Symmetry: C3
Subunit: 90 residues, 3 copies
């Protein structure tokens, strides 16, 4: 089930069990081993109602995707990860 | 694994991966594409120690279930979803 | 998929769907029916950057594992559980 950082190979980022459908970019409820770079922005957000924060592998700093955070409290999930599929192995 | 709103058929509300057993009403750790109506209440809560908030499909406003939030910090999960099985497709 | 408290048998603590790899002790994103005892500590933490809180079964008080809580905001997950495998069935 593991989806690992493609660059450093060994580092698990998420699992297929975390995949969900909100409507290239995999959306998952939970992820691991990522560092958040900077502050959320809503500029060009692919998911209306959410802001994005760059997320990179904590081991090799590969840009894997973004943490998406809801701007309104009545939305669900309040946060998820949108991950570039080609930056993950399997 | 997708569990969709029975009414609008398009909208995924949770997945079989998210099901867990707290103890008609499916309980899941995580859900999607729900709007929360109102503020939490504990009155007649089906899960003692948790407050509920009505949760409806964001597309068709069909009442799918409730978001349950823990009233005490030492409980696990601190939040979950109780979904009406008859309001979702697959079974 | 259910992993139940071995002692009281009937209480589910987590499911295989919740297992992930942060790298005897199973790590899962989500768990249920556990009571937390005391306050977080980083003393001897098995997971640098996380503090631990003892977690016991809400029904039989068997010690199942620990809740791990991030000491910094930019970590993912912000929390998880580490559960003693021999304290669970399947
Ligand atoms: N490569 C660049 C370069 C400039 C601006 C953006 C990107 C980029 O990937 N995104 C994403 C961030 C994530 C998102 O939701 N929408 C975007 O357009 C930008 O805003
Ligand atoms: N249809 C009605 C009408 C009045 C009050 C409630 C309901 C209802 O479904 N619940 C639920 C909310 C969720 C819960 O935990 N227990 C309930 O009885 C009510 O409190
Ligand atoms: N049985 C004892 C006795 C004293 C201290 C600890 C333990 C114990 O199991 N842990 C764990 C807590 C969880 C952890 O992260 N590291 C540990 O060493 C202790 O700190
Ligand atoms: Zn990496
Ligand atoms: Zn709907
Ligand atoms: Zn037990």
């Amino acid at each position: 089930t593991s989806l690992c950082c493609k660059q450093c190979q060994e580092t698990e980022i998420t699992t297929k069990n975390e995949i969900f459908s909100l409507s290239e970019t995999l959306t998952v409820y939970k992820a691991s081993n990522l560092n958040l770079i900077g502050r959320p922005s809503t500029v060009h957000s692919w998911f209306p109602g959410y802001a994005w924060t760059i997320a990179q592998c904590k081991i090799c700093a590969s840009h894997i995707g973004w943490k998406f955070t809801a701007t309104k409290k009545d939305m669900s999930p309040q946060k998820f990860w949108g991950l570039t599929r080609s930056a993950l192995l399997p």
